[PDB]
Coordinates of C-alpha atoms and ligand atoms in Angstrom, one line a residue:
Chain A
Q1 CA 16.9 -16.7 -0.5
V2 CA 15.4 -13.9 1.7
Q3 CA 12.0 -14.8 2.9
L4 CA 9.6 -13.3 5.5
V5 CA 6.5 -15.2 6.4
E6 CA 3.7 -13.6 8.5
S7 CA 1.2 -15.5 10.6
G8 CA -1.5 -15.0 13.2
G9 CA -4.1 -13.0 11.4
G10 CA -7.8 -13.7 11.7
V11 CA -11.1 -12.3 12.9
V12 CA -11.1 -10.6 16.4
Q13 CA -13.6 -8.5 18.3
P14 CA -12.9 -4.8 19.1
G15 CA -11.1 -4.5 22.5
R16 CA -9.3 -7.8 22.3
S17 CA -5.7 -8.7 21.5
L18 CA -3.9 -10.6 18.8
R19 CA -0.2 -11.5 18.3
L20 CA 1.3 -11.7 14.8
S21 CA 4.6 -13.5 14.0
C22 CA 7.0 -13.0 11.1
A23 CA 9.5 -15.8 10.4
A24 CA 12.7 -14.5 8.8
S25 CA 15.0 -16.7 6.6
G26 CA 17.8 -16.2 4.3
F27 CA 19.7 -13.4 5.9
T28 CA 21.4 -12.5 9.2
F29 CA 18.2 -11.3 11.0
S30 CA 20.0 -9.5 13.8
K31 CA 21.8 -7.1 11.4
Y32 CA 18.6 -5.4 10.2
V33 CA 15.9 -3.1 11.4
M34 CA 12.5 -4.8 11.0
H35 CA 9.0 -3.3 10.6
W36 CA 5.3 -3.9 10.4
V37 CA 3.5 -2.1 7.7
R38 CA -0.3 -2.3 7.2
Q39 CA -2.8 -1.7 4.4
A40 CA -6.4 -1.2 5.2
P41 CA -8.9 -2.4 2.5
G42 CA -8.7 -0.1 -0.5
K43 CA -6.1 2.2 1.1
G44 CA -2.4 2.8 0.9
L45 CA 0.6 1.7 3.0
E46 CA 0.8 2.7 6.6
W47 CA 4.0 2.1 8.7
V48 CA 3.0 0.8 12.1
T49 CA 6.1 0.0 14.1
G50 CA 9.8 -0.8 13.7
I51 CA 12.5 -2.3 15.9
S52 CA 16.2 -1.8 16.1
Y53 CA 18.8 -4.5 15.4
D54 CA 19.2 -5.9 18.9
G55 CA 15.6 -5.2 19.9
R56 CA 16.5 -2.4 22.4
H57 CA 14.8 0.5 20.5
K58 CA 11.1 0.3 19.4
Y59 CA 9.5 3.0 17.2
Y60 CA 5.7 3.4 16.9
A61 CA 3.2 5.3 14.7
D62 CA 1.1 7.6 16.9
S63 CA -1.9 5.7 15.9
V64 CA -0.8 2.5 17.7
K65 CA 1.6 3.7 20.5
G66 CA 0.2 2.5 23.7
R67 CA -1.8 -0.3 22.2
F68 CA 0.6 -2.3 20.0
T69 CA 4.0 -3.6 21.0
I70 CA 6.8 -4.8 18.8
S71 CA 9.5 -7.3 19.8
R72 CA 12.0 -9.6 18.2
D73 CA 13.7 -12.8 19.1
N74 CA 17.2 -13.0 17.4
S75 CA 17.8 -16.5 18.5
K76 CA 14.9 -17.9 16.6
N77 CA 14.8 -15.2 13.9
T78 CA 11.2 -14.0 14.5
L79 CA 9.5 -10.7 14.6
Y80 CA 6.3 -10.2 16.7
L81 CA 3.5 -7.7 16.8
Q82 CA 1.4 -7.7 20.0
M83 CA -1.8 -5.9 19.2
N84 CA -4.1 -4.8 22.1
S85 CA -7.2 -2.7 22.4
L86 CA -8.0 -3.4 18.7
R87 CA -10.4 -1.3 16.8
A88 CA -12.4 -1.5 13.6
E89 CA -9.9 0.8 11.9
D90 CA -7.1 -1.6 12.6
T91 CA -8.5 -4.0 10.0
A92 CA -5.8 -4.5 7.4
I93 CA -3.2 -6.7 5.8
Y94 CA -0.2 -6.7 8.1
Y95 CA 3.2 -7.0 6.3
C96 CA 6.6 -7.7 7.8
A97 CA 9.4 -5.8 6.1
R98 CA 13.1 -5.8 6.3
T99 CA 15.1 -2.5 6.2
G100 CA 18.1 -2.8 3.8
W101 CA 21.4 -1.6 5.2
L102 CA 21.1 1.6 3.0
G103 CA 17.7 2.3 4.5
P104 CA 14.7 1.3 2.2
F105 CA 12.3 -1.6 2.9
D106 CA 13.9 -4.1 0.5
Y107 CA 12.0 -7.3 1.3
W108 CA 8.3 -7.8 2.3
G109 CA 6.3 -10.8 3.3
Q110 CA 3.0 -11.7 1.7
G111 CA 1.1 -10.4 4.7
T112 CA -1.5 -11.7 7.0
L113 CA -5.1 -10.3 7.3
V114 CA -6.5 -9.0 10.5
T115 CA -10.2 -8.3 10.6
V116 CA -11.5 -6.5 13.7
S117 CA -15.3 -6.8 13.8
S118 CA -18.2 -7.4 16.3
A119 CA -20.1 -9.2 13.5
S120 CA -21.2 -12.8 13.5
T121 CA -20.8 -15.1 10.6
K122 CA -23.9 -14.8 8.5
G123 CA -24.8 -15.8 4.9
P124 CA -26.2 -13.2 2.5
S125 CA -29.7 -12.4 1.6
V126 CA -29.9 -12.3 -2.2
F127 CA -32.4 -10.1 -4.0
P128 CA -33.1 -9.6 -7.7
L129 CA -32.0 -6.5 -9.6
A130 CA -34.8 -6.9 -12.1
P131 CA -34.4 -5.9 -15.8
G139 CA -31.5 -3.2 -27.3
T140 CA -29.5 -4.0 -24.2
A141 CA -30.9 -4.9 -20.8
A142 CA -29.2 -4.9 -17.4
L143 CA -30.1 -7.3 -14.6
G144 CA -28.4 -8.5 -11.4
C145 CA -28.4 -9.8 -7.9
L146 CA -27.9 -7.8 -4.7
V147 CA -25.9 -9.8 -2.2
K148 CA -26.7 -8.2 1.1
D149 CA -25.7 -8.5 4.8
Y150 CA -23.0 -11.2 5.0
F151 CA -19.9 -11.7 7.1
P152 CA -17.0 -12.4 6.8
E153 CA -15.7 -12.0 3.3
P154 CA -15.7 -13.5 0.7
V155 CA -18.6 -14.3 -1.4
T156 CA -18.5 -15.7 -4.9
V157 CA -21.1 -15.1 -7.6
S158 CA -21.6 -16.9 -11.0
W159 CA -24.4 -16.6 -13.5
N160 CA -26.1 -19.7 -14.9
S161 CA -23.7 -21.9 -13.1
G162 CA -20.8 -20.3 -14.9
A163 CA -22.1 -20.4 -18.5
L164 CA -22.9 -16.7 -18.5
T165 CA -19.7 -14.6 -18.3
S166 CA -19.9 -12.1 -21.1
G167 CA -20.9 -8.7 -19.7
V168 CA -20.9 -9.8 -16.0
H169 CA -19.5 -7.4 -13.4
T170 CA -19.4 -8.5 -9.8
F171 CA -18.5 -5.5 -7.7
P172 CA -16.1 -5.5 -4.8
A173 CA -17.9 -5.7 -1.4
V174 CA -18.6 -2.6 0.7
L175 CA -18.5 -2.7 4.4
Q176 CA -21.8 -1.3 5.6
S177 CA -22.3 0.8 8.8
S178 CA -23.8 -2.4 10.3
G179 CA -20.5 -4.3 10.1
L180 CA -21.9 -6.5 7.4
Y181 CA -20.7 -6.6 3.8
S182 CA -22.8 -6.1 0.7
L183 CA -22.1 -6.3 -3.1
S184 CA -24.0 -6.6 -6.3
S185 CA -23.4 -8.7 -9.4
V186 CA -24.8 -7.4 -12.7
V187 CA -24.9 -8.5 -16.3
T188 CA -26.0 -6.8 -19.6
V189 CA -27.7 -9.0 -22.2
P190 CA -29.8 -8.6 -25.3
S191 CA -33.1 -7.1 -24.3
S192 CA -34.6 -9.6 -26.8
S193 CA -33.3 -12.6 -24.7
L194 CA -35.3 -11.5 -21.7
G195 CA -38.3 -13.6 -22.7
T196 CA -36.2 -16.5 -24.1
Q197 CA -33.5 -17.1 -21.6
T198 CA -33.4 -17.7 -17.8
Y199 CA -30.9 -15.8 -15.7
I200 CA -30.0 -17.2 -12.3
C201 CA -27.2 -15.9 -10.1
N202 CA -25.3 -18.5 -8.0
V203 CA -24.1 -17.0 -4.7
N204 CA -21.7 -19.1 -2.5
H205 CA -20.6 -17.8 0.9
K206 CA -18.3 -20.6 2.2
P207 CA -17.7 -19.2 5.7
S208 CA -21.4 -19.9 6.4
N209 CA -21.7 -23.0 4.1
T210 CA -24.5 -21.1 2.3
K211 CA -25.3 -21.4 -1.4
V212 CA -28.2 -19.4 -2.9
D213 CA -29.5 -19.6 -6.5
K214 CA -31.7 -16.7 -7.4
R215 CA -33.7 -16.4 -10.6
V216 CA -34.0 -12.9 -11.9
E217 CA -37.2 -12.1 -13.8
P218 CA -38.6 -9.0 -15.4
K219 CA -41.2 -7.2 -13.3
Chain B
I3 CA 20.6 14.3 8.3
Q4 CA 23.4 15.0 5.9
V5 CA 26.4 12.8 6.3
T6 CA 29.7 14.2 5.0
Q7 CA 32.9 12.2 4.4
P8 CA 35.9 13.0 2.1
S9 CA 35.7 12.0 -1.5
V10 CA 39.1 10.3 -1.4
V11 CA 41.7 9.2 1.1
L12 CA 45.1 7.5 0.7
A13 CA 45.9 4.6 3.0
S14 CA 49.3 4.6 4.6
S15 CA 52.2 2.3 3.6
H16 CA 51.1 0.0 6.5
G17 CA 47.5 -0.2 5.2
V18 CA 45.8 2.3 7.5
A19 CA 43.2 4.8 6.2
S20 CA 41.8 7.4 8.5
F21 CA 39.0 9.8 7.6
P22 CA 36.1 11.7 9.4
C23 CA 32.5 11.1 9.0
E24 CA 30.2 13.9 10.2
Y25 CA 26.5 14.6 10.3
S26 CA 24.3 17.6 10.5
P27 CA 22.2 19.0 12.0
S28 CA 22.7 17.9 15.6
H29 CA 19.4 16.5 16.6
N30 CA 18.9 15.4 20.2
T31 CA 20.1 11.8 20.5
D32 CA 21.7 9.6 23.2
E33 CA 23.0 6.8 20.9
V34 CA 24.7 7.1 17.5
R35 CA 25.3 4.0 15.4
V36 CA 28.0 4.2 12.8
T37 CA 28.5 1.6 10.0
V38 CA 31.1 1.4 7.3
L39 CA 29.9 -0.4 4.2
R40 CA 32.0 -1.3 1.2
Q41 CA 30.4 -1.2 -2.3
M46 CA 27.2 -4.0 -0.2
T47 CA 29.4 -5.6 2.5
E48 CA 29.6 -4.6 6.2
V49 CA 33.1 -3.6 7.1
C50 CA 32.3 -2.6 10.8
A51 CA 29.6 -1.2 12.9
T52 CA 29.5 0.3 16.4
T53 CA 27.3 2.3 18.8
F54 CA 28.5 5.4 20.5
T55 CA 27.0 6.6 23.8
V60 CA 35.9 4.7 21.4
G61 CA 34.3 2.1 19.3
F62 CA 34.3 -0.9 16.9
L63 CA 35.3 -3.4 19.6
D64 CA 33.7 -6.2 17.6
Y65 CA 35.9 -5.4 14.6
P66 CA 39.7 -5.6 14.8
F67 CA 40.2 -3.7 11.5
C68 CA 38.2 -0.7 12.6
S69 CA 38.6 1.9 15.3
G70 CA 37.0 5.2 16.0
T71 CA 36.3 8.1 18.3
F72 CA 33.1 10.2 18.4
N73 CA 32.9 13.9 19.4
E74 CA 30.1 16.4 18.8
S75 CA 28.7 15.1 15.5
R76 CA 31.9 13.7 14.0
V77 CA 33.5 10.2 14.1
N78 CA 37.2 9.9 13.4
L79 CA 37.3 6.5 11.6
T80 CA 40.4 4.4 11.2
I81 CA 40.4 1.3 9.0
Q82 CA 43.5 -0.9 9.2
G83 CA 44.7 -4.1 7.6
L84 CA 44.1 -2.7 4.1
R85 CA 45.8 -4.2 1.0
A86 CA 45.7 -3.0 -2.6
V87 CA 42.8 -5.3 -3.4
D88 CA 40.8 -3.4 -0.6
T89 CA 40.9 -0.2 -2.7
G90 CA 37.3 0.8 -3.1
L91 CA 34.5 3.0 -2.0
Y92 CA 33.6 3.0 1.7
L93 CA 30.3 4.4 2.7
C94 CA 29.7 6.0 6.1
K95 CA 26.2 5.3 7.6
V96 CA 25.1 7.3 10.6
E97 CA 22.0 6.5 12.7
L98 CA 20.6 8.6 15.6
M99 CA 19.0 5.7 17.4
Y100 CA 17.2 7.0 20.5
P101 CA 15.2 8.9 21.7
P102 CA 13.0 9.1 18.7
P103 CA 12.8 10.2 16.0
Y104 CA 15.2 7.7 14.5
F105 CA 17.3 9.3 11.8
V106 CA 19.6 7.6 9.3
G107 CA 22.0 9.2 6.8
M108 CA 24.3 7.8 4.2
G109 CA 27.5 9.5 3.2
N110 CA 28.5 9.6 -0.5
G111 CA 31.5 7.4 0.1
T112 CA 35.2 7.7 0.6
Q113 CA 37.3 6.2 -2.1
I114 CA 40.3 4.7 -0.4
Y115 CA 43.4 4.0 -2.4
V116 CA 45.7 1.4 -1.0
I117 CA 49.2 0.7 -2.4
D118 CA 51.2 -2.5 -1.6
Chain C
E1 CA 7.3 14.7 10.4
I2 CA 7.6 14.1 6.6
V3 CA 4.5 14.2 4.4
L4 CA 4.8 12.9 0.8
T5 CA 2.4 13.9 -1.9
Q6 CA 2.2 12.0 -5.2
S7 CA 1.0 13.2 -8.5
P8 CA -0.9 12.4 -10.7
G9 CA -3.4 10.2 -8.8
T10 CA -3.8 8.2 -12.0
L11 CA -1.5 8.0 -15.0
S12 CA -3.2 6.7 -18.1
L13 CA -0.9 5.3 -20.8
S14 CA -0.2 2.6 -23.3
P15 CA 2.5 0.0 -23.6
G16 CA 5.7 1.5 -25.1
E17 CA 5.0 5.0 -23.7
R18 CA 6.9 6.7 -21.0
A19 CA 5.6 7.0 -17.4
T20 CA 6.6 9.9 -15.2
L21 CA 5.4 9.8 -11.6
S22 CA 6.1 12.6 -9.1
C23 CA 6.7 12.6 -5.4
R24 CA 7.0 15.9 -3.4
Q25 CA 8.4 15.7 0.2
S26 CA 7.5 18.2 3.0
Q27 CA 11.2 19.0 3.8
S28 CA 14.6 18.4 2.4
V29 CA 16.8 16.3 4.7
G30 CA 20.3 16.6 3.5
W31 CA 20.3 13.6 1.2
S32 CA 17.7 11.6 -0.7
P33 CA 16.3 8.6 1.3
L34 CA 13.5 8.4 -1.2
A35 CA 12.2 5.0 -2.3
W36 CA 9.6 3.8 -4.8
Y37 CA 7.6 0.6 -4.5
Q38 CA 5.3 -1.2 -7.0
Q39 CA 2.2 -3.0 -5.9
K40 CA -0.2 -5.3 -7.9
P41 CA -3.6 -6.4 -6.5
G42 CA -3.3 -9.1 -3.9
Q43 CA 0.5 -8.9 -3.7
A44 CA 3.0 -7.3 -1.4
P45 CA 4.8 -4.1 -2.3
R46 CA 8.1 -4.5 -4.2
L47 CA 11.1 -2.1 -3.9
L48 CA 12.0 -0.6 -7.3
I49 CA 14.3 2.4 -6.5
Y50 CA 16.0 3.8 -3.5
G51 CA 18.3 6.7 -2.7
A52 CA 16.2 8.5 -5.4
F53 CA 18.1 6.9 -8.3
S54 CA 19.4 3.4 -7.4
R55 CA 17.7 0.3 -8.8
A56 CA 17.0 -2.5 -6.4
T57 CA 18.0 -6.1 -7.2
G58 CA 16.5 -7.7 -10.2
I59 CA 14.6 -4.6 -11.2
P60 CA 14.5 -4.0 -15.0
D61 CA 16.5 -1.2 -16.4
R62 CA 13.5 0.6 -17.7
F63 CA 12.9 1.8 -14.1
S64 CA 14.8 4.9 -13.2
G65 CA 14.6 7.6 -10.6
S66 CA 15.8 11.2 -10.3
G67 CA 15.4 14.2 -8.1
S68 CA 16.8 15.8 -4.9
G69 CA 15.8 18.1 -2.1
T70 CA 12.0 17.8 -2.0
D71 CA 11.0 16.8 -5.6
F72 CA 11.5 13.3 -6.9
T73 CA 10.4 11.3 -10.0
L74 CA 10.1 7.7 -11.0
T75 CA 10.4 7.0 -14.7
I76 CA 9.4 3.9 -16.6
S77 CA 11.1 4.6 -19.9
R78 CA 9.0 2.3 -22.1
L79 CA 6.0 0.8 -20.3
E80 CA 5.4 -2.9 -20.4
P81 CA 2.0 -4.6 -19.8
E82 CA 3.4 -6.0 -16.5
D83 CA 3.9 -2.5 -15.2
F84 CA 0.3 -1.4 -14.9
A85 CA 0.1 -1.3 -11.1
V86 CA 0.0 1.1 -8.2
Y87 CA 3.3 2.9 -7.3
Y88 CA 4.2 4.4 -3.8
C89 CA 7.0 6.7 -2.7
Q90 CA 8.4 6.6 0.8
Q91 CA 10.8 8.6 2.8
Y92 CA 13.1 6.4 5.0
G93 CA 15.5 8.9 6.5
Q94 CA 13.6 9.3 9.8
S95 CA 10.8 7.9 11.8
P96 CA 7.8 7.8 11.4
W97 CA 8.6 6.1 8.1
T98 CA 6.0 7.7 5.7
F99 CA 4.5 6.9 2.3
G100 CA 2.8 8.8 -0.5
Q101 CA -0.8 8.0 -1.2
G102 CA 0.0 6.1 -4.4
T103 CA -0.2 6.7 -8.1
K104 CA -2.2 4.2 -10.2
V105 CA -0.7 3.5 -13.7
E106 CA -3.7 2.3 -15.8
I107 CA -4.3 1.5 -19.5
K108 CA -5.4 4.4 -21.6
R109 CA -8.3 3.9 -24.0
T110 CA -10.8 6.2 -25.7
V111 CA -13.6 7.9 -23.9
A112 CA -16.7 5.7 -23.4
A113 CA -19.8 7.1 -21.7
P114 CA -21.5 4.8 -19.2
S115 CA -24.7 3.0 -19.9
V116 CA -26.8 3.8 -16.9
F117 CA -29.5 1.6 -15.3
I118 CA -31.6 2.2 -12.1
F119 CA -33.1 -0.7 -10.0
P120 CA -35.9 -0.3 -7.5
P121 CA -35.8 -2.4 -4.2
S122 CA -37.3 -5.8 -4.7
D123 CA -40.6 -6.6 -3.0
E124 CA -38.8 -9.4 -1.2
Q125 CA -36.4 -7.0 0.4
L126 CA -39.0 -4.4 1.4
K127 CA -40.8 -7.2 3.3
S128 CA -37.6 -7.3 5.5
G129 CA -37.9 -3.5 6.2
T130 CA -35.1 -2.0 4.2
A131 CA -35.0 -0.6 0.7
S132 CA -31.8 -0.7 -1.4
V133 CA -31.9 1.3 -4.6
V134 CA -29.1 0.6 -7.1
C135 CA -27.7 2.7 -9.9
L136 CA -25.4 1.0 -12.3
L137 CA -22.9 2.8 -14.6
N138 CA -21.6 0.2 -17.1
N139 CA -18.4 0.0 -19.2
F140 CA -17.2 3.6 -19.1
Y141 CA -13.8 5.3 -19.4
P142 CA -12.2 7.3 -17.8
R143 CA -12.8 6.2 -14.2
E144 CA -13.9 9.6 -12.9
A145 CA -17.7 9.8 -12.4
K146 CA -20.3 11.6 -10.3
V147 CA -23.4 9.8 -9.2
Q148 CA -26.0 12.0 -7.4
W149 CA -29.1 10.6 -5.8
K150 CA -32.3 12.6 -5.8
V151 CA -35.5 11.5 -4.1
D152 CA -38.6 13.7 -4.9
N153 CA -35.9 16.0 -6.1
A154 CA -34.1 16.4 -2.9
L155 CA -30.4 15.6 -3.1
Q156 CA -29.2 12.8 -0.9
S157 CA -26.1 12.7 1.3
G158 CA -24.7 10.1 3.6
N159 CA -27.1 7.3 2.7
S160 CA -25.3 5.9 -0.4
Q161 CA -22.2 3.8 -1.1
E162 CA -20.2 3.2 -4.3
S163 CA -18.1 0.3 -5.6
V164 CA -16.0 0.1 -8.7
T165 CA -14.6 -2.8 -10.7
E166 CA -11.0 -3.0 -11.8
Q167 CA -10.2 -2.2 -15.4
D168 CA -11.8 -4.8 -17.7
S169 CA -9.3 -7.1 -19.2
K170 CA -11.0 -7.1 -22.6
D171 CA -12.1 -3.5 -23.1
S172 CA -10.2 -1.5 -20.4
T173 CA -13.4 0.1 -19.1
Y174 CA -14.7 0.5 -15.6
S175 CA -18.2 -0.2 -14.2
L176 CA -19.6 1.3 -11.0
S177 CA -22.5 0.8 -8.7
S178 CA -24.1 3.3 -6.3
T179 CA -26.4 1.9 -3.7
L180 CA -28.9 4.1 -1.8
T181 CA -30.1 2.5 1.4
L182 CA -33.4 3.8 3.0
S183 CA -35.7 2.4 5.5
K184 CA -38.9 1.0 4.1
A185 CA -40.8 3.7 6.1
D186 CA -38.8 6.4 4.2
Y187 CA -38.9 4.5 0.9
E188 CA -42.7 4.5 1.1
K189 CA -42.8 8.2 1.9
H190 CA -41.5 9.3 -1.5
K191 CA -42.3 8.8 -5.1
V192 CA -39.5 9.8 -7.6
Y193 CA -36.2 8.0 -7.2
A194 CA -33.5 9.2 -9.6
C195 CA -29.8 8.6 -10.4
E196 CA -28.0 11.5 -12.1
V197 CA -24.6 10.6 -13.7
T198 CA -21.9 13.1 -14.8
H199 CA -19.1 11.6 -16.9
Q200 CA -16.7 12.8 -19.6
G201 CA -18.4 10.9 -22.3
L202 CA -21.7 12.7 -21.6
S203 CA -22.2 16.3 -22.9
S204 CA -24.7 16.8 -20.0
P205 CA -25.8 14.6 -17.1
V206 CA -27.9 11.6 -17.7
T207 CA -30.8 10.8 -15.3
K208 CA -32.4 7.4 -14.8
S209 CA -35.4 7.4 -12.5
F210 CA -38.4 5.3 -11.5
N211 CA -41.7 6.0 -9.6
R212 CA -42.1 3.9 -6.5
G213 CA -44.7 1.5 -7.8
Ligands
LIG1 C1 26.2 13.7 -2.2 O1 26.2 13.5 -3.6 C2 25.0 14.1 -4.2 C3 25.0 13.7 -5.7 O2 26.1 14.2 -6.4 C4 25.9 14.0 -7.8 O3 26.4 12.8 -8.2 C5 27.8 12.5 -7.9 C6 28.0 11.0 -8.4 C7 28.7 13.5 -8.6 O4 28.7 13.2 -10.0 C8 28.2 14.9 -8.3 O5 29.0 15.8 -9.2 C9 26.7 15.1 -8.5 O6 26.3 16.4 -8.1 C10 25.1 15.6 -4.0 O7 23.8 16.2 -4.4 C11 24.1 17.2 -5.3 O8 24.6 18.4 -4.7 C12 24.8 19.5 -5.5 C13 25.4 20.6 -4.6 O9 24.4 21.2 -3.8 C14 23.4 19.9 -6.0 O10 23.4 21.2 -6.7 C15 23.8 21.3 -8.1 O11 24.3 22.7 -8.3 C16 24.7 23.0 -9.7 C17 25.2 24.4 -9.8 O12 24.3 25.3 -9.1 C18 23.4 22.7 -10.6 O13 23.8 22.9 -12.0 C19 22.9 21.2 -10.4 O14 21.8 20.9 -11.3 C20 22.6 21.0 -9.0 O15 21.5 21.8 -8.6 C21 22.8 18.8 -6.9 O16 21.5 19.1 -7.3 C22 22.8 17.5 -6.0 N1 22.4 16.4 -6.9 C23 21.6 15.4 -6.5 C24 21.4 14.3 -7.5 O17 21.2 15.3 -5.4 C25 25.2 15.9 -2.5 O18 25.4 17.3 -2.2 C26 26.3 15.1 -1.8 N2 26.4 15.3 -0.4 C27 27.5 15.6 0.3 C28 27.3 15.8 1.8 O19 28.5 15.8 -0.3

């Protein structure tokens, strides 16, 4: 079966280099044009670079020409992406894709994530969003890298919970809120605690959210 | 690029079909890669810069924007649709075009 | 260089209905190297159609494509629940290989106006020197919404940031936050903080506001 498996992604600071690898199986690798395609968070697909059958011809998007280099090794059936002079905007999922003989990109790997940041690993600060329906929540501010998880009352409160996707702030740190709507009558009867876990920093915060 | 090839050709008694495959417009290129595909299996492929040396059943010559293909060794079971693929490989842009296919009739 | 423009941005439909997605290409190129891909959250793109009208391997028959020259369409004859996804077109006849911006096929439901809530910064946060003001728009449909921040009645620009959930699995609505970030210094300068929401389920904008303190 045709498989493509990317590797090498991770966190890197602007200005440095990273090499990605794509392992091809299940077809005669040398008989196909191969590509890298990327997808920045919340955005569409952007072709980055492609490479001819025998490796002689390399094609680049203007955005990466001069900084990224593509190569292939047809004896070990691997595609590479050498990324240099990385920038924040190069943060993306990087997919390896085969070109079918009729021209389309007929198989794709699952992708490998590249994060280009100057930020240091940092757990969030958690602040209350204080309250016949009431809304309340927790603001989960200034953490890096992703992800953070949020539950309410250790998982027992799920109805009406919305935990928003993170936003990357100008500072390079992420932020998100988790919110829940509840009976305004329950505000004096029940306790509402958000459980924030940011495993990259081994941090776990429980924050009680009270009226006033 | 638009690739043109004849809708139908008749192979000879001796199992040889010849037909042109042509592309337009004539973009600047130094290397043109031609593939014959049978509907997908690869019949032969070559790069022009007289071709198909890796493929005893295929030969071809390339002039202007037209390849004169010859496919030999054909038998009645080989009757089928043979697509011409043309690539303008370098310098960029890369271009690829698929012909609509030549139906080759072979009689034993 | 070939630019592709997809329309609509979002198609809103129910299972069993027909989806028609359009892709317009900058130039004709003498044949139709036009492909369509499906993408679900957290997954790689999947080839559906190529050469404008050919189905790729293992793709269900309800997917079809048509068109020529510059104008192409993807049709899902009778939508299935597994088909709500993002769809991209792509031209692959020349480098740079280029893609459309994507069309989201989402579940259609009735209009639902948002419930709107405003949150002042916490005292704990202000002690740290920054003030986050949050506006919540809860369980609304359709997705389109305008959130305008006004402070003392001046309109704000460049100091807010929005986030939206995916369509809810039970009620097919969206929820949205808008977060206004000010310095404590600037937060303390002003008095009226207000969030004004325009949405289809609201005859006229709703405003939620508080007075600092
Ligand atoms: C490669 O083949 C395509 C597709 O041809 C279509 O499918 C084949 C299996 C046959 O059944 C053909 O009969 C059929 O057209 C060709 O594209 C087609 O080209 C024609 C000619 O320019 C286009 O024009 C048509 O003109 C008539 C009369 O004015 C109209 O009524 C039609 O609606 C149409 O506009 C036609 O649109 C176009 N079709 C598609 C799907 O692209 C293509 O020309 C051919 N290429 C070469 C080099 O031969």
